[PDB]
C-alpha cells in the first residue's frame, strides 16, 4: 500500500554526520521467505517470513497475592489495581501498537541544531575538567550490570544455551572483539534488532556488551551533576526535590509523549559527537561514532497477524532511540537536558555569553535554576517570575525539534507547580515524613500500582523461586515504602511468610540495582542510614506520612482496612512451610 | 667474622635451577660508601651507610578501649598474657632469629618434586590454570597504608595507597619486568621493619608485580579442603571438628622459625611448581624470573656499632619474606607437600598410591584429613596410623631443616584426642550451642584477645573509629567468650553511629561486609549457622565449666568490672553524639 518518502536529514555545521553502514550482512542472518508488503508509514519493508516465531512469556505471586486478596475490593473501586490484565499479545496487536506508536516519522529539520550544539559542547567541557575522559568499562563492570535473565535473540537462538549462561561459557570475548571490526569496517553482523511486547526492541547478546563497554561510562557524570539522580534510590529523590524548590520556588514537570520515537537523528548526531570529545582515545571516538551510525538509521523485525498468516517483517528507520540497549538511559538523561537547558535560556532572554555559566550552575546545584533529569522524566525548578516567561514562551522550542508534551495543547503555557507535593518525578510524588528530629520526602504513589507490581511477575522452578521473588519484594516495600501504612504492614507481612536463607540477591541479579540491602539480617536501622544516614534508629523513629494525607492514593482507614490488617496473621501463617526457617513475626514490629 | 656458606647447592632432577640474578643495579639504588665488617653468620655483608635515617613509631593504647578494660587489668596481668625498635637491638634480633643457615643438602627432593607435581596436577583439572591477576583484582588486595621503600621515598610519596591511584605504577612495574626477566634487576633490595619479628618488605613496583603473577595462588587455596583460605575464624572450628570425627587423633607440631628455616631447594620445588601450573610459557618466566630475586635475596638492616648507626647490606639464600602478598599462599602449599611426604614415608604408603592421597585429601576423603594455614598445620589421622607416624615422621621433617618448636629433635609426637585441646591458627576452639545445633567457636587467652584490641596518649576521630572497628570484630568472633562480648557491646556503645569503619583500617582487615553500623543477632547468624538461627537469645556461650584457664573467671573483680561499665561508656561519650542505643541491653544485667 503506502509507500515511505520523508525529508533529507539536515546537515549541523561542526557535526559529523552519521552515514548508514552496510547492512547487507545482517540481513542475511533473518531469511525472509518473501518480498515487502509496504503497509508501514515511516518504517520501509524489506520482506516478510511465515509463522517463524511467536511471543510468549507472567502469573500472580501466591505468597503475595494471598496477603492482598482481602484487599482486592478496595483496590480495584478507588485505585489503580488491576490494570495489568494482558495476556500474552497476539501478533495483530503487536503490529497495530508498533503502528501507533512508533510508525511515526521524527522531525529531523529545525533550525535550533546550532543553539543545541554548543550546549552540548559547555555541556562536554565542564564534564572533561571535574570528571574526565570516558574510559572504558573493563569486563568486571559489565557483569555488575548485564541482566542475567535475557534472550539473546533469535540471531543466537542456534549456538546454544540461553545470557548469563553464555556470561559463564565464555564464548562472549571474541563475540564482542569480532564486531569492533565489523562495525568500523561497516559490515556490521547480528545488527538487526528484535522485538518484543509485554514495544521493547532488544539485540543480540554480544555487541549489548560492546555499548556497555564503549558507553558504559557515561553513568559517572550524572553520578556527580546535582542535575541527574543516577545511582540514588527512591529513598533519596524526595529530599533532591525539596532542595530544589527551595531555591527556587516554581516548578514546572512536562512530560514528552513517546520520547524514544521522537528524537531526531539530528539529536543522535550532536549526542555522537558530544560523546566523541568525551572519548579516551582516538580509537574510541571512532568507537563512538561508528556505533552512533548503527543507533541512527536502524533495522527491526516485527511480528503481524493478518487473520491467519504470521509473519516476520523486517524494517528500516532513522534517528529513533532504541528501546531495549544498556546504555540508552544515560544518552536520553543527558539529550533531555540538554535540549530543555537550550529552550530555556531562549525563553528566558539569557544571552550566548552567559551559557556557559549557566551549564555549571545547573550541574552544580546553585543559582534561581535547578534542574532534574532521568530519561524521558524532567522537574524545571525555577524563580516565580522566570517560571512564567518560561510557561508562556519555552514551548515553542521544544515543538521545533518534534517534542510534543502529552495531554496538553501543542502552544498550552506550562502548569507552575507550587505544592513541592504535586510534582511527579519518576512515577512518585514526594510526602514529607517524620524521622526522629528530622523531616524527609519519600516517594509516594498510587498503593495500587505499588501492590500490583509486588504481585505479578518468567521463573526458573515455579515455587521456592517463587517465594524468594516474593520476599526480595518484601524488602523492597520495606525499604522505599515503609512510610506508607499498608507498604509496610504488608512488606512486614511478606517476610513474616517468607523462608530465611533464601537466594535472594543471587535471583533477580539483572533488575536488582543496590543489592546491599537484600539481606536476612536487614533491620530498622538499616533503612535508617539510607534515608537519615544513620542520624536516627528504632522502629520508633521510623515514621509515617500525615494521618490527613492517608487518603486518595493511598488507602483510608476504613472498615476493610481493618479487615485485611486482622486477617494477614493467619494468612502469613497459611503460608508458611512445615518446619521451615521462618523470621519471627515481622509484624511484631509495627505497633498495632 | 667468616662467611662460609657452602652449603653447596643442591642439584634436583627435572628442575629448573634458581640462578642469582645480577644484583649491581640494586645496590647502586642503595648508595653505600663503607666497608663490610662481617658479623652476620649466615648473611654476606658487602657493606653500610651511616646513620641515613633510624626507625620510629606509635603503639598507643586506645582511649576508648584503654579505659573499658582498665577495671581488668589487675586481673588480666596476673593470671593472663596481658601487658606482653633500637637499631642497636633490631640487629641483635635479626642476628639470632634470622641469621641462620637453611639445610640446603638432603636427598628428599625427588620424593618432594612428585608431591609438588601431583597435587599441581590434580589442581589444574578441578581448578584450571593460574590466571594472572588484573589491576581492579590487584587492588581489592593491596594494603594502602605501606611504604614503599627507602628506593623511592625521595621521590616525596608519602604512602602506597594515594599513589596507587595515580597509575603511575604501570609504567614503574613494566620497566622494571624488563630488568627482572633479563637480568640487571632494579629496585630488588628488600628493606627491613622491626615488629619489635624483622619484617622484610620489597618495594611498591615489586609489590604490584609479585601481585599480578602470584595472587591467583588464592583460588587454588579455596577449592581444597586442606586450607582455610577465605574463610573467617567462626568457620575454622567446624572445619578441625569435621577432621577429628573422620580420623579422632591429631597432630599439630609447629615449626620455630618457618620463614627462617626454608631452603632454596624447596623454593625451587616452589617455583616449578608454579611454572607448570602457569597460564602461558611468558606466565613461566615471570614465575621464574621472580623466583631468582626470591631465592638468593639482598637485604639492608640496621645496626648500633660504637654509638653509630649503620644501613648495613646484606646477602642471604633460600629464605621465605614475610612482606609478600604470594608469601602466604606458598607457605601454605610447601608446608602441605613437606608434610604430606612425610606422612607418605612414615605410613609405608607406596608411591603408586600418592596420587590418591593428594586427591582425597584435597576432596576430604578418608581416614586422612590436614588443614593448613601458613606455617600452621593440624594432621588428622586414624588411631593407629597417628601412633606410627608419632615415632617415624620427624626424621624426614628434620633432614629437611625443619625442627619442631619446645621438642626433643627425634621426640615422638602427642597424639591428641579431645578435640578442644587443638591449636590452629593460635586458636583453641570449644563447643558452643546456637538454639539446636552445636559449633565450634574460636577460644584463646583474653588476656591477648582484648590487648590488641587496645594495640597497646592523644585522640582523633579515626582513633574512634579504630575502636568500633575493634569492638564489630570481637563481637563476630568472640561473642561466645562471656567478658569478649560485654567489652564488642561496650564498645559499641562508646563508638558514635556514622563513622568511616569500613574505610579506615580496611587494609588488614579482610571480609569487612559485615563492619556496618545496621549489625545485629541474625548478621552473627547468617555466618555461623547460615542463618537457620536467629536472635540474641540464641547467640550461645562457652560452657561455664570452662569458664576458666584461657577465659576469665567470674569472681569479685569480674563482676566488679560489669557494674563499672556502665559509667565508663557514658565517661567516653560526646556530647550531641549518635550513639547507638545501649547495644549492653542486649546481654542479660
Known amino acids: 500500500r503506502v509507500e515511505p518518502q520523508w525529508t533529507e536529514e539536515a546537515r549541523i555545521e561542526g557535526c559529523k554526520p552519521l552515514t548508514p553502514l552496510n547492512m547487507t550482512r545482517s540481513v542475511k542472518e533473518m531469511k525472509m521467505d518473501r518480498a515487502p508488503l509496504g503497509i508501514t508509514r515511516f518504517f520501509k519493508e524489506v520482506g516478510y517470513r511465515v509463522a517463524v516465531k511467536k511471543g510468549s512469556e507472567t502469573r500472580k505471586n501466591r505468597f503475595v497475592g494471598a496477603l492482598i486478596e482481602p484487599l482486592k475490593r478496595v483496590l480495584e473501586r478507588s485505585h489503580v489495581f488491576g490494570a495489568w490484565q494482558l495476556t500474552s499479545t497476539t501478533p495483530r496487536a503487536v503490529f497495530n501498537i508498533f503502528r501507533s506508536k512508533v510508525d511515526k516519522a521524527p522531525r529531523e529539520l529545525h533550525d535550533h541544531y546550532p543553539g543545541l550544539k554548543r550546549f552540548y559542547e559547555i555541556l562536554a567541557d565542564l564534564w572533561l575538567k571535574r570528571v574526565g575522559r570516558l574510559r572504558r568499562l573493563s569486563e568486571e563492570e559489565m557483569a555488575a550490570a548485564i541482566n542475567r535473565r535475557g534472550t539473546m535473540g533469535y540471531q543466537m537462538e542456534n549456538r546454544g544455551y540461553t545470557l548469563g549462561s553464555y556470561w559463564d561459557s565464555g564464548e562472549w570475548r571474541q563475540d564482542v572483539n569480532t564486531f569492533k571490526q565489523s562495525l568500523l ?8 534488532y528484535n522485538t518484543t511486547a509485554k514495544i521493547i526492541q532488544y539485540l543480540p547478546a554480544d555487541a549489548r556488551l560492546y555499548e556497555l563497554r564503549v558507553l558504559g561510562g557515561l553513568h559517572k557524570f550524572l553520578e556527580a551533576s546535582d542535575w541527574s539522580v543516577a545511582g540514588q534510590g527512591l529513598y533519596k529523590y524526595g529530599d533532591r526535590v525539596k532542595k530544589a524548590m527551595n531555591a527556587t520556588g516554581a516548578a514546572i514537570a512536562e512530560d514528552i509523549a513517546g520520547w524514544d520515537t521522537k528524537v531526531s537523528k539530528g539529536l543522535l548526531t550532536l549526542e555522537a559527537h558530544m560523546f566523541c570529545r568525551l572519548a579516551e582515545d582516538a580509537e574510541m571516538e571512532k568507537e563512538i561514532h561508528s556505533l552512533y551510525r548503527l543507533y541512527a538509521n536502524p533495522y527491526m523485525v516485527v511480528q503481524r497477524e493478518i487473520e491467519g498468516e504470521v509473519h516476520d517483517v523486517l524494517l528500516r528507520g532513522r534517528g529513533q532511540v532504541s528501546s531495549g540497549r544498556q546504555p540508552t538511559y544515560a544518552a536520553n538523561t543527558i539529550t533531555n537536558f540538554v535540549t530543555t537547558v537550550y529552550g530555556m535560556a531562549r525563553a528566558l532572554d539569557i544571552p550566548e555569553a552567559d551559557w556557559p555559566e549557566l ?19 524532567k522537574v524545571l525548578f525555577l524563580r516565580g517570575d522566570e517560571a512564567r516567561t518560561y510557561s508562556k514562551k519555552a514551548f515553542r522550542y521544544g515543538n521545533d525539534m518534534g517534542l510534543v508534551r502529552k495531554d496538553m495543547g501543542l502552544e498550552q503555557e506550562s502548569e507552575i507547580i507550587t505544592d513541592v507535593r504535586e510534582i511527579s518525578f519518576c512515577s512518585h510524588q514526594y510526602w514529607p515524613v517524620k524521622y526522629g528530629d528530622e523531616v524527609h520526602y519519600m516517594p509516594v504513589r498510587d498503593v495500587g500500582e505499588i501492590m500490583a507490581k509486588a504481585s505479578m511477575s518468567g521463573v526458573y522452578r515455579d515455587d521456592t523461586t517463587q517465594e524468594a521473588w516474593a520476599r526480595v519484594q518484601g524488602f ?3 525499604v522505599n515504602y515503609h512510610h506508607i501504612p499498608e507498604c509496610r504492614m504488608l512488606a512486614l507481612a511478606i517476610l513474616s511468610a517468607t523462608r530465611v536463607g533464601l537466594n535472594l540477591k543471587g535471583i533477580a541479579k539483572g533488575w536488582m540495582m543496590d543489592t546491599e540491602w537484600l539481606r536476612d539480617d536487614l533491620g530498622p536501622d538499616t533503612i535508617h542510614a539510607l534515608v537519615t544516614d544513620g542520624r536516627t534508629q528504632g522502629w520508633s523513629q521510623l515514621g509515617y506520612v500525615d494521618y490527613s494525607s492517608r487518603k486518595g492514593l493511598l488507602l483510608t482507614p476504613d472498615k476493610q482496612y481493618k479487615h485485611w490488617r486482622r486477617g494477614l496473621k493467619d ?12 523470621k519471627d513475626w515481622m509484624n511484631k514490629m509495627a505497633v498495632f
Open 359 to 377: 551549564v555549571r550552575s545547573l550541574t552544580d546545584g546553585s543559582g534561581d535554576r535547578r534542574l532534574l533529569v532521568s530519561g524521558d522524566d
Open 571 to 582: 494468612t502469613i501463617n497459611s503460608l508458611r512451610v512445615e518446619g521451615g526457617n521462618y
Open 185 to 192: 569496517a561497516g559490515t556490521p553482523t547480528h545488527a538487526v
Open 476 to 478: 523492597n516495600m520495606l
